[PDB]
Swiss-Prot record, chain A:
Assigned protein family: Belongs to the PI3/PI4-kinase family.
Name recorded for this polypeptide: Serine/threonine-protein kinase mTOR
Subcellular location: Lysosome membrane; Endoplasmic reticulum membrane; Golgi apparatus membrane; Cell membrane
Renumbered ranges of HEAT repeats: 40-74, 75-114, 117-155, 158-197, 200-238, 241-280, 284-306
Lineage: Eukaryota, Metazoa, Chordata, Craniata, Vertebrata
UniProtKB/Swiss-Prot annotation, chain C:
Keywords linked to the UniProt accession: Acetylation, ATP-binding, Cell membrane, Developmental protein, Endoplasmic reticulum, Host-virus interaction, Isopeptide bond, Lysosome, Membrane, Nucleotide-binding, Phosphoprotein, Ubl conjugation, Zinc
Major localisation: membrane
Protein's job: Component of the mechanistic target of rapamycin complex 2 (mTORC2), which transduces signals from growth factors to pathways involved in proliferation, cytoskeletal organization, lipogenesis and anabolic output. In response to growth factors, mTORC2 phosphorylates and activates AGC protein kinase family members, including AKT (AKT1, AKT2 and AKT3), PKC (PRKCA, PRKCB and PRKCE) and SGK1. In contrast to mTORC1, mTORC2 is nutrient-insensitive. Within the mTORC2 complex, RICTOR probably acts as a molecular adapter. RICTOR is responsible for the FKBP12-rapamycin-insensitivity of mTORC2.
MF term (GO), any: molecular adaptor activity
Family: Belongs to the RICTOR family.
Name of the featured protein: Rapamycin-insensitive companion of mTOR
Length: 306, 167, 638
């Protein structure tokens, strides 16, 4: 830990004569460059040849893994336009790519150091058109993006964040197949633990949606609808108290009748996080006299440590 | 169905979503040779208009398999490409832009003989987008160069976003 | 006839409340209520019309509420908003009075005459100008999507009313954003769609009226509407993209100033605590010239604070006058910084300006309500201008004309900066009030302003690469003012400016404007070094468009027809000589023809164009023109 300049001079001597002056020599050098932080002027604009008009697989895939790590030292108005140019060059290849794997890899390099750079008018429309998708796991953080950019620029998003929520409840009470229900039970579970700031004046979308949709005849429904109840009290406290003399009745089918096996490691966690969050105390605990000893069989039958 | 909504007007939103799971089971199985059920259904789809903007995510994603599955016959997929064009002029698709660029690449790779029918599909979409084309400039260099697509109108809408005209 | 009398009665009530006879005018609030009840609460028991009487009573009440608003705030505006919300949620006949409530700040009520729901988005799109409507189109699309969501919530009656409750509770973050940053453009765009949604849906209109019936938000919207007209000449005006930095500078200026913008909701209760806090903060943070825009709220609420004392701020004004008379060595002084809210007490002692306003309102009573808020500010600025012209540097500005002492020295008089070339180079670079100098040369005194216009010509010699707004202001003043023969000769030696081509192409009737324009194009077409060629091609295309668009003008256009023939002979000579510029001019003419094409007349000219394209051309030079003429050929064929 005394000569970093020796490694830096060796890197600038070896990589510059390979990159500036075939296939594996690009990857084995760009993975070497993106390993630790440096002090980077001409090496940023060197990427105007690789991921623009390539037809391979591992060129546009590794385009966001290096440039997101080289910009770690992020008032000096010198390289701000360079960061904006890199942020504009990543979106024209993270959206226009046909492969789902590269579109999954362009979201694994986003950090919290770009909150003030995404407030421009030329960068909001890049994520305004990234809502509809056939790939399911890209749309999981699609609500997290508009929830993170909700409180940062609230003066220009107030019609936008209220018109994505009205299309949510239209498919809960009007679904007939298990695929849409299985997708919706995973989609609604992300907003209850990522962005509480769009929930506290918005009781009415999530209040009525978690009443009638708890009586579905596939263990995946029990595993995924209850993920919303798993964080039901973190976003609001002492608000749902006047309507919870019926929620603790249907839980026994999750406990007894061991025929439809569900993930009890998250089910017991869901039934446990509701106590010490919004203040649930003695008032339901006498209405069941029989389930006090069934937990003695729960703690002796299943051998799951979780 | 198609005689009800043409005589009442624009008030039929109160009985719409009670028949969407009845339509989800249509595209799953079809024992009829030739698939006349979807052909008779698209004739009622073409008279929707501009009143189905609140239940578009339950009918527009499940109609991708009709022009993608190899089990579909040839006259079945010929009448469903302009069906989106019949409702593109009435509806708005400022947020729906990603699913009409990427699947049509692998759609055109399978059936190149249906170019004269599928050539009008993207036209009504790029007439609706406007200033949402400058991102997808090398996409032509991805697609049309591979497939030798030439038409006199295509040099207009590519140029119109470059010079900055609006019509 | 009733707009002047209601304003005079409100001014008399404010003068009685400000004086010692406050008990003789405190019982007129019901008299301010029945005028609000004769058009709104008149249809509560029985509906009657009297439609013209209700329309005249609503407009006079709207003018009295938008004139000063010292009576409704804050014990009568909350009762007036609730009565209007109850009248809008009662029936469809009483709900039509909201447009007069919408015509005060967000006026666009005559866009759609209740037909139809599909034409409401087209009316909202046509409600703009629309020159630069990039963000306005996205705002109109968001408003149309919000109206569609409200229509879905109205059609989800009555077992899926969660979206109606979301639309009713859609002012949670909007009330917090307007109290900290003072930006309610999206709320004004969403409130403008409530008049379009009230055409055929009673429950959606009732939900939209109950959603915007907040008493805490109505006063903030009124303050935002009253403060939007004060930044027209006091602060700097810019676009929508540059307003964020100005809003951040106006919202975050000091530490003690942040405890009054979000707080003090009932500002019309005492109206003495904020002025005392400002007078206490100005004595501490002196000799720094900070908070240039933070004192606008104290200046706007200076005349509205009728419940204050007579000589409460006399010691603070004396301390400010003593501090301003000994801080001339700071290097940054502004006479309109904090002196606008301090000199108002000398002209508002006991019914001084009220009688002069009432005499001007009763003398004509025709248009004494639109520009009254600007005339009062001009009178308050001119009341202290005689002391500012004698207390500041009046004979030292010509000997110490530096970059710091040239703040407001450019508009002292008409002959103040008639030959100052040093300040013009800074005024052209800053451009804070560059458009205000052209109004003095166009309003009056046309005989003594042309030399000042020559100073504008000096600006035409100063900054050749001017902006679009400065070019538009230079083209409008040269066309609006007569005797522009000296300004039309500026294009004789222009490099890339061309400031007399578009101004002369609108209306040309003199021989001097036609004899020089017929030879300038022929002189510019000869120099084939691409500098004057594209300008001559654009001028010929603009002349052809002005000759083709004028279907009825004119009867005395024989000289214009001769100039058009001389330009068409020069266009034929340029087509026989050149190939690239001729193809560019032909593509421009084809675009100008296809922009307003309505027949198949362009297809008949293809047989005459194909014979001319093969007469005198090339194969390599026309390859660049063939990539751009294909769109024109496709537009002419189809």
């Amino acid at each position: 830990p005394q000569l970093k300049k020796d490694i830096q001079d060796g890197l600038l001597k070896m990589l510059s004569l390979v990159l500036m002056h075939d296939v594996g020599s690009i990857t084995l050098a760009l993975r070497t460059l993106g390993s630790f932080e440096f002090e980077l002027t001409q090496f940023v604009r060197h990427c105007a040849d690789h991921f623009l008009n390539s037809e391979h697989k591992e060129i546009r895939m590794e385009a966001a893994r290096t440039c997101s790590r080289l910009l770690t030292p992020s008032v000096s108005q010198t390289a701000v336009q360079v960061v904006a140019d890199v942020l504009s060059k990543l979106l024209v290849v993270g959206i226009t790519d046909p492969d789902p794997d590269i579109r999954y890899c362009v979201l694994a390099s986003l950090d919290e150091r770009f909150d003030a750079h995404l407030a421009q008018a030329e960068n909001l429309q890049a994520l305004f058109v990234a809502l509809n998708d056939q790939v399911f796991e890209i749309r999981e953080l699609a609500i997290c993006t508009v929830g993170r950019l909700s409180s940062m620029n609230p003066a220009f998003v107030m019609p936008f964040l209220r018109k994505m929520l009205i299309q949510i409840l239209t498919e809960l009470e009007h679904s007939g197949i298990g695929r849409i229900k299985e997708q919706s039970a995973r989609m609604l579970g992300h907003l209850v633990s990522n962005a509480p700031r769009l929930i506290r004046p918005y009781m009415e979308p999530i209040l009525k949606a978690l009443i009638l949709k708890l009586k579905d005849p596939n263990p995946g429904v029990i595993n995924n609808v209850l993920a919303t109840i798993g964080e039901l009290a973190q976003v609001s406290g002492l608000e749902m108290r006047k309507w919870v003399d019926e929620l603790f009745i249907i839980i026994m089918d999750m406990l007894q009748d061991s025929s439809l096996l569900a993930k009890r490691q998250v089910a017991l966690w869901t039934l446990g996080q509701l106590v010490a969050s919004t203040g649930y105390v003695v008032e339901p605990y006498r209405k069941y006299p029989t389930l006090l000893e069934v937990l003695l069989n729960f703690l002796k039958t299943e051998q799951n440590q979780g | 169905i198609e005689q009800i909504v043409v005589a009442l007007g624009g008030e039929f939103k109160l009985y719409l979503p009670q028949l969407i799971p009845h339509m989800l089971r249509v595209f799953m199985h079809d024992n009829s040779p030739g698939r006349i059920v979807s052909i008779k259904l698209l004739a009622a789809i073409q008279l929707f208009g501009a009143n189905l903007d609140d239940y578009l995510h339950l009918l527009l994603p499940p109609i991708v398999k009709l022009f993608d599955a190899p089990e579909a016959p040839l006259p079945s997929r010929k009448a469903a490409l302009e069906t989106v064009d019949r409702l593109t002029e009435s509806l708005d698709f400022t947020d729906y832009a990603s699913r009409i660029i990427h699947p049509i690449v692998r759609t055109l790779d399978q059936s190149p003989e249906l170019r004269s029918t599928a050539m009008d599909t993207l036209s009504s979409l790029v007439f609706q987008l406007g200033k949402k084309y400058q991102i997808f400039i090398p996409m032509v260099n991805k697609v049309l160069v591979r497939h030798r697509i030439n038409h006199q109108r295509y040099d207009v809408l590519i140029c119109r976003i470059v010079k900055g005209y609006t019509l | 006839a009733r707009s002047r009398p209601d304003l005079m009665d409100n001014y008399l009530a404010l003068i009685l409340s400000a004086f010692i006879r406050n008990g003789l005018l405190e019982g007129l609030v019901e008299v301010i209520t029945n005028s609000d009840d004769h058009i709104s609460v008149r249809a509560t028991i029985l509906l009657g019309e009297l439609l013209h009487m209700a329309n005249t009573i609503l407009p006079h009440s709207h003018s009295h509420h938008l004139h000063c608003l010292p009576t409704l705030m804050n014990m009568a505006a909350s009762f007036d908003i609730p009565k209007e919300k109850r009248l809008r949620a009662s029936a469809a006949l009483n709900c039509l009075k909201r447009f007069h409530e919408m015509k005060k700040r967000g006026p666009k009520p005559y866009s759609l005459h209740l037909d139809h729901i599909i034409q409401k988005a087209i009316a909202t799109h046509q409600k703009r100008d629309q020159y630069l409507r990039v963000q306005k189109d996205i705002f109109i699309l968001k408003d149309t999507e919000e109206a569609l969501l409200i229509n879905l919530r109205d059609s989800q009656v009555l077992q899926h009313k969660e979206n109606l409750e979301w639309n009713w509770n859609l002012i949670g973050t909007i009330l917090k954003w307007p109290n900290v940053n003072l930006r309610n453009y999206k709320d004004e765009q969403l409130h403008r769609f409530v008049r379009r949604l009230l055409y055929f849906y009673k429950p959606s209109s009732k939900l939209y009226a109950n959603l915007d019936l907040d008493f805490a938000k109505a006063k903030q919207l009124t303050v935002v509407g009253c403060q939007f007209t004060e930044f027209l000449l006091e602060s700097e005006e810019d676009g929508q993209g540059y307003l964020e930095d100005l809003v951040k500078d106006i919202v975050q200026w000091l530490n003690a100033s942040s405890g009054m913008k979000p707080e003090r909701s009932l500002q019309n209760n005492g109206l003495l605590t904020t002025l005392s806090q400002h007078y206490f903060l100005f004595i501490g943070t002196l000799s720094c010239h900070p908070h240039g825009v933070k004192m606008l709220e104290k200046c706007s609420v200076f005349q509205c604070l009728l419940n204050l004392c007579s000589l409460k701020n006399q010691d603070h004004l004396l301390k400010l006058t003593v501090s301003s008379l000994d801080y001339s060595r700071d290097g940054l002084a502004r006479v309109i910084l904090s002196k606008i809210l301090t000199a108002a007490t000398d002209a508002c002692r006991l019914y001084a300006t009220k009688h002069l306003r009432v005499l001007l309102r009763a003398n004509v009573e025709f248009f004494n309500n639109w520009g009254i808020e600007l005339l009062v500010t001009q009178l308050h600025d001119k009341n202290k201008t005689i002391s500012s012209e004698a207390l500041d540097i009046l004979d030292e500005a010509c000997e110490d004309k530096a970059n710091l002492h040239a703040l407001i020295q450019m508009k002292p008089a008409l002959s103040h900066l008639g030959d100052k070339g040093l300040l013009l180079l800074l005024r052209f670079l800053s451009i804070p009030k560059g458009f205000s100098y052209l109004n003095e040369r166009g309003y009056v005194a046309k005989q003594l302003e042309k030399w000042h216009r020559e100073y504008n010509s000096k600006y035409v010699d100063l900054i050749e690469e001017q902006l679009n707004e400065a070019l538009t202001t230079y083209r409008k003043p040269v066309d609006g003012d007569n005797y522009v023969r000296r300004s039309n000769q500026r294009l004789q030696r222009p490099h890339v400016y061309l400031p007399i081509h578009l101004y002369g192409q609108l209306v040309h009737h003199k021989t001097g404007c036609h004899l020089l324009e017929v030879q300038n194009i022929i002189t510019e077409l000869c120099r084939n070094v691409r500098t004057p060629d594209l300008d001559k091609w654009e001028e010929i295309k603009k002349l052809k468009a002005s000759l083709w668009a004028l279907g009825n003008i004119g009867s005395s256009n024989w000289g214009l027809n001769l100039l058009q023939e001389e330009n068409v002979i020069p266009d034929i000579l340029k087509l026989a000589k050149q190939c690239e510029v001729l193809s560019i001019r032909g593509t421009c003419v084809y675009v100008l023809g296809l922009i307003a094409k309505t027949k198949q007349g362009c297809d008949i000219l293809k047989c005459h164009n194909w014979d001319a394209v093969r007469h005198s051309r090339k194969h390599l030079w026309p390859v660049v023109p063939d990539d751009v003429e294909q769109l024109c050929n496709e537009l002419s064929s189809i």
